[PDB]
Amino acid sequence: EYGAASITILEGLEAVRKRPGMYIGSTGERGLHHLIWEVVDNAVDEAMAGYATTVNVVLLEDGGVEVADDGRGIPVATHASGIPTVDVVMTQLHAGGKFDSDAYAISGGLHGVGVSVVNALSTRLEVEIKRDGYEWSQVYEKSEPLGLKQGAPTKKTGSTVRFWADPAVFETTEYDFETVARRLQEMAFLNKGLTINLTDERVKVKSRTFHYPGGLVDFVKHINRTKNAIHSSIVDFSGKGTGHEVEIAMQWNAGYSESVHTFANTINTHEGGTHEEGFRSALTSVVNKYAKDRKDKDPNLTGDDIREGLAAVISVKVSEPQFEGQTKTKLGNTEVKSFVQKVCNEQLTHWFEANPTDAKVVVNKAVSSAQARIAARKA
Amino acid sequence: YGAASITILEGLEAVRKRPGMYIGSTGERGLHHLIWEVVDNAVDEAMAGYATTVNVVLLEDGGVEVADDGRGIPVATHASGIPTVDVVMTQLHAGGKFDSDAYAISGGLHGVGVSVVNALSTRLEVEIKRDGYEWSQVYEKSEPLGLKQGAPTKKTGSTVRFWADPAVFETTEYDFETVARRLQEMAFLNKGLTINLTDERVTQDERAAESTAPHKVKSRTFHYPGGLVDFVKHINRTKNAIHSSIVDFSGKGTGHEVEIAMQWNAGYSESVHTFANTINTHEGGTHEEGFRSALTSVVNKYAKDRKLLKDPNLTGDDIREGLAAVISVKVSEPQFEGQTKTKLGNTEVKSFVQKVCNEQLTHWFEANPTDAKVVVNKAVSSAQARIAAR
Ligand SMILES: Nc1ncnc2c1ncn2[C@@H]1O[C@H](COP(=O)(O)OP(=O)(O)NP(=O)(O)O)[C@@H](O)[C@H]1O
Numbered sequence A: 001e002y003g004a005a006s007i008t009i010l011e012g013l014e015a016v017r018k019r020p021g022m023y024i025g026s027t028g029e030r031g032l033h034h035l036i037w038e039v040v041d042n043a044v045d046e047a048m049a050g051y052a053t054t055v056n057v058v059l060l061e062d063g064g065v066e067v068a069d070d071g072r073g074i075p076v077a078t079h080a081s082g083i084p085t086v087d088v089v090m091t092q093l094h095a096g097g098k099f100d101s102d103a104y105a106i107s108g109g110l111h112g113v114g115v116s117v118v119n120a121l122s123t124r125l126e127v128e129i130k131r132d133g134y135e136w137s138q139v140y141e142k143s144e145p146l147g148l149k150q151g152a153p154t155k156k157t158g159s160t161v162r163f164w165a166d167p168a169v170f171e172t173t174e175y176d177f178e179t180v181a182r183r184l185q186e187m188a189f190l191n192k193g194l195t196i197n198l199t200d201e202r203v204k205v206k207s208r209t210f211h212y213p214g215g216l217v218d219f220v221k222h223i224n225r226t227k228n229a230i231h232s233s234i235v236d237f238s239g240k241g242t243g244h245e246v247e248i249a250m251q252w253n254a255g256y257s258e259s260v261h262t263f264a265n266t267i268n269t270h271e272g273g274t275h276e277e278g279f280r281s282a283l284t285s286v287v288n289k290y291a292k293d294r295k296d297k298d299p300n301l302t303g304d305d306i307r308e309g310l311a312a313v314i315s316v317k318v319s320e321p322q323f324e325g326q327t328k329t330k331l332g333n334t335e336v337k338s339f340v341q342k343v344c345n346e347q348l349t350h351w352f353e354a355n356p357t358d359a360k361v362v363v364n365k366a367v368s369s370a371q372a373r374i375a376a377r378k379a
Numbered sequence B: 001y002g003a004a005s006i007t008i009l010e011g012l013e014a015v016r017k018r019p020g021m022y023i024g025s026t027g028e029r030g031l032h033h034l035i036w037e038v039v040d041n042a043v044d045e046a047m048a049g050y051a052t053t054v055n056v057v058l059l060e061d062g063g064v065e066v067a068d069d070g071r072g073i074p075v076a077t078h079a080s081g082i083p084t085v086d087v088v089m090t091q092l093h094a095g096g097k098f099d100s101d102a103y104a105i106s107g108g109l110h111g112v113g114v115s116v117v118n119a120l121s122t123r124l125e126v127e128i129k130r131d132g133y134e135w136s137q138v139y140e141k142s143e144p145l146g147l148k149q150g151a152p153t154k155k156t157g158s159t160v161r162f163w164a165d166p167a168v169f170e171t172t173e174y175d176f177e178t179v180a181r182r183l184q185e186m187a188f189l190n191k192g193l194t195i196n197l198t199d200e201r202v203t204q205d206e207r208a209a210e211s212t213a214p215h216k217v218k219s220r221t222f223h224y225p226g227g228l229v230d231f232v233k234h235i236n237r238t239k240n241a242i243h244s245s246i247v248d249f250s251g252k253g254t255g256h257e258v259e260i261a262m263q264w265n266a267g268y269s270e271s272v273h274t275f276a277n278t279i280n281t282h283e284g285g286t287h288e289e290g291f292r293s294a295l296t297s298v299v300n301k302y303a304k305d306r307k308l309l310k311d312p313n314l315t316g317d318d319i320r321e322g323l324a325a326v327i328s329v330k331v332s333e334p335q336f337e338g339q340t341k342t343k344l345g346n347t348e349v350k351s352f353v354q355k356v357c358n359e360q361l362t363h364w365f366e367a368n369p370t371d372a373k374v375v376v377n378k379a380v381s382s383a384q385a386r387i388a389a390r
């Protein structure tokens, strides 16, 4: 019979180990790599806040991942739930300091689930925290804490998370260096002044330094390095509104491909959302309202043909975000659709006028790319 | 910053704080997700073979009635010392889908579904028929208002009535057509299942006879014995048929079942619909990727054998061109990207779907050379059309 005894309540991390796909999105390489993002995105939130200026990540030999920061560190002192804050953050879901714009103003994190999930789907988790004028060591064996130990009193501040992914959870436990390198480089572009270092101590040692003072501009310079830029200038505009900011940097390449990267609080919203679509709505209307004003191909230009051969970065800095899942693939802030739309619309028009040479080259590009579609459609 | 700067959200409080995590967005999708998490549950009872009918009413006031003739949400006092209805409704990771006992194949697996609805609903009323009684329990701003044992009954089932909190959603008007298409697929995926949809807001389902005629309410009845085959007909109802014989094949194994129905149209758009335990895995997944790669490989070695190519390269993205296909898996232990269950991640399912498609597709292509050659030729023209772009 189906009744009272059939229904069961899972105790937090039990839910993560049972259904990892809800928090990690998959048990495959994508989900494996997601444990690094939870830990690094957390460290980078401290740099978004400004308390950290350096984040070092290590792909350890054994299988571990070491992520350090010169931030404030994970609160150590006794939490209101009894157990010290470190343990709360590491073992309990919806236990975070990103539920308000107090501790962290603009942050990638928001659910209070990230590093707790890492702790769940990890065999071991070690944390080093230099805070409250002292160093701290706490070890998590199979998610369970071994006890909080206090070390040497240091003036320096920050946290160092280390984690060994559970192979019983994950098919592959070996990370991809280029996947890590790529993502960390983006976080460096999206956070001017920040330095990310990645070393691969796997069996000489592979290491990268990621510091881009040119921010989003160097990001496009990077995307259009291999593939010839059609124009010299790089559109670089930044709008700021009520609990949301937006920096947009873009340039068109001589290729026939879309290279439009979208971010929200550094976090890679690679399914876009209401910041991508807000940028898309403005870019389609601006280029069309410029093409119509200048010079013709009677139907309207598609966004997909306007964006064909475009390297574009859309980075939004929102106070109260609305992310798709723990994965954070899509942005849902309805308000941010119209916020990016307006900033994008006024500033895009302002670039077109100011740069008539580049404008002519990119609109002719949108026309020739559109004419090619109708031409192919005829077959 | 410190210990005081850390808060712990108590289940439903977290859903209300971060709705997107669970429902995706507080826009159309998320509002519609609410109805899905409630209907998904009824379909689970239908999949378990207890419920034969799901009724979903979109009420004038904005609420949603969801009635089923399943077993009914457990009413008896739970181990936690509270009615099991209460647990199911007010607690996350609380459910009967963690093991395969109560439900063999079910969309639900996280135990978050119907509790999220309650969290994002200003009112959720519940009527359960089980244990020889009609049980009622009202949830006002998530909080239960008392379980009532009413009229005796031999009849069984659940009736969930929620009211999405306008404080959460950008808009609260549900789109009937969004609802009709989603409930429709559920009836294609489940052969013996009948889903009734009725919109109490809309009134449409000589002129003198039309006035005197009783006042109808907008209604649809979804029952499809033709299953996936009648689903492939539905997709190609507005697309010209290139081959008559609809592809229909099954595949049962270790901890999964796979049903494929596919037919090619004159179109240039890929209409490949994938489902894991009736859930719309519209962001693809292992089953789709397993099918894609098997379909690429089958078509290629057929074209190589028949000398229909043998000479360049036949990508899957040009084989699926103008393909109406439905990939429905019944996985005992499913994997999903988040509460929205957008992508099916079961690695073993990929290889399983690959081999089932590999053997049965070849079997179909060999059995029907009249239909087979016309498909390969459509992939031939729609390959030159690809290279035309270059
Ligand atoms: N490296 C760190 N330095 C300082 N504070 C940290 C660090 N890592 C985690 N925290 C704190 O611990 C909390 C919990 O982390 P986490 O579990 O990732 O949830 P979250 O960051 O609030 N949101 P989310 O990332 O969406 O799950 C955070 O809110 C931070 O306040």
Ligand SMILES: Nc1ncnc2c1ncn2[C@@H]1O[C@H](COP(=O)(O)OP(=O)(O)NP(=O)(O)O)[C@@H](O)[C@H]1O
Binding pocket: A007, B037, B040, B041, B042, B045, B068, B070, B071, B072, B073, B074, B088, B094, B095, B096, B097, B098, B102, B107, B108, B109, B110, B111, B112, B113, B114, B115, B116, B157, B158
């Ligand atoms: N209409 C119903 N009839 C009988 N039992 C139900 C019904 N709806 C929900 N339940 C029970 O309540 C439990 C919890 O529901 P729910 O919150 O939607 O999570 P879930 O069904 O386990 N799955 P999920 O959608 O992944 O969160 C289910 O597992 C069922 O056992």
Ligand SMILES: [Mg+2]
Binding pocket: A038, A039, A041, A042, A108, A109, A110, A114, A115
């Ligand atoms: Mg985080």
Ligand SMILES: [Mg+2]
Binding pocket: B037, B040, B041, B107, B108, B109, B113, B114
């Ligand atoms: Mg469910």
